[PDB]
């Protein structure tokens with residue numbers, strides 16, 4: 001590891017600096033280094049890890065979608081087929097994306113998840129596991145597409161089971177998990193009715209628990225609830 | 237070169253794809269590969285090279301400014317001095333920025349400029365040379381700050397001399413050169429009066445030649461003239 | 473239009 | 482506020 005010589009606290013500090021500077025690849029590298037120190041992550045540190053990798057993979061996903069669209073348009077009878085370059089470059093970006101997902105999944109497997117015993121930590125990491133299998137699913141076409149989809153489903157389901165037992169329905173981790181699992185159902189699993197049902201039940205059960213929250217917690221929960229509502233509006 | 241095995245035309249095509257995908261580091265790598273084929277660049281290809289590297293260095297400059305600001309605030313009596321991390325990370329980004337500038341300057345020196353015999357090509361590359369010395373100047377503090385500044389000045393001046401002899405005052409390359417040289421004078425050389433005089437004379441001489449232009453050329457020229465006016469408004 | 477997942481901020 | 486140089490687009 002290129003970060004093995006740097007102090008854990010220095011890596012975390014530099015991740016925060018990288019975030020300010022909008023240097024998300026650096027941020028991710030610093031947070032990978034921090035994880036590889038072998039200690040459990042705090043809430044704030046888990047968020048740093050997530051922000052970093054979400055930004056990196058988000059850029060890759062956006063690029064892949066642009067290239068895939070150009071490729072699909074190129075592979076038709078209308079304009080012109082301009083040789084192997086679009087496919088080659090889409091494949092390059094795809095492979096880089098898959099690599100990032102593999103890196104995150106690797107951190108989760110070695111050994112964030114197995115050491116995570118509190119509900120907040122375990123659900124957070126299982127949600128992440130679902131998310132990065134979902135990103136793999138977005139680009140999968142081969143023999144393993146089904147298995148990738150099932151891996152995402154299984155991670156999300158384990159997270160859901162823990163979240164329903166251990167967290168209130170307004171907990172932002174529980175809400176974000178349900179949001180993402182609902183996106184999985186709609187966009188990946190071809191199960192829009194499951195997506196809609198999950199989003200609606202999640203929204204309604206959260207609504208009923210808002211009365212228990214402080215002003216600040218209310219803001220946190222309702223912001224995610226809005227996203228559930230936005231998807232329901234799109235889907236229905 | 238990692239791009240040595242790829243066809244020139246494929247590199248150019250992939251640079252265009254990378255631009256669409258907002259993958260500017262890839263775009264720059266593809267264009268570096270194209271330059272290293274040893275053939276002169278067309279107008280469109282020169283623009284691709286410029287767009288790619290401007291975006292890469294622009295991200296670095298933005299990050300460096302964020303980190304420098306945090307560092308300067310940290311190096312005062314008010315809050316707290318939090319060890320070497322901000323300086324270290326600012327230095328890392330600085331070194332990466334300097335490396336990009338060195339790469340571009342290297343392409344220009346080996347051998348874009350010496351092969352560029354037409355006014356449009358030669359002025360374009362000399363402007364680029366000025367620009368990347370200017371970016372080095374933005375971060376320079378040591379023994380060579382003066383020499384870096386003079387290198388930028390000398391490149392811009394050679395470009396100006398050719399542009400005044402060979403191009404109309406509305407030519408977009410001539411206008412962009414004058415714009416950037418005026419920024420050099422104001423921001424780097426501590427010569428705001430020179431900056432203002434150059435911007436005003438450039439604007440006025442262009443205004444007087446607009447009548448010669450087609451609708452499309454008028455749009456090209458006036459867009460850059462607006463930037464001269466914006467700076468003059470800021471500076472006065 | 474694509475569904476919205478949990479954002480960073 | 483910083484001066485404006487020639488943009489990409």
Ligand SMILES: *CC(=O)NCC1CCN(C(=O)C2(Nc3ccc(Cl)cc3)CCCC2)CC1
Nearest residue numbers: 043046047124127172173176177479480481
């Ligand atoms: C304590 C702990 O592990 N907290 C994680 C923290 C929860 C609060 N939070 C959010 O509400 C946003 N992002 C996420 C990210 C992942 C999940 Cl599972 C839930 C929510 C921040 C902006 C959108 C919601 C940050 C992460």
Ligand SMILES: *CC(=O)NCC1CCN(C(=O)C2(Nc3ccc(Cl)cc3)CCCC2)CC1
Nearest residue numbers: 279282283360363408409412413488489490
């Ligand atoms: C033929 C040739 O070399 N053209 C370069 C080309 C000129 C037109 N153009 C522009 O007007 C913008 N960018 C630049 C970039 C560099 C210079 Cl020296 C001048 C103008 C495009 C948006 C801003 C103006 C692109 C480059």
Ligand SMILES: [Cl-]
Nearest residue numbers: 088089092250
């Ligand atoms: Cl490629």
Ligand SMILES: [Cl-]
Nearest residue numbers: 014324325328
């Ligand atoms: Cl560093």
Ligand SMILES: [Mg+2]
Nearest residue numbers: 006007008009
């Ligand atoms: Mg230590």
Ligand SMILES: [Mg+2]
Nearest residue numbers: 078079080081
């Ligand atoms: Mg045809």
Ligand SMILES: [Mg+2]
Nearest residue numbers: 090091094095
């Ligand atoms: Mg593939």
Ligand SMILES: [Mg+2]
Nearest residue numbers: 242243244245
């Ligand atoms: Mg060839």
Ligand SMILES: [Mg+2]
Nearest residue numbers: 314315316317
């Ligand atoms: Mg103090």
Ligand SMILES: [Mg+2]
Nearest residue numbers: 326327330331
């Ligand atoms: Mg230095």
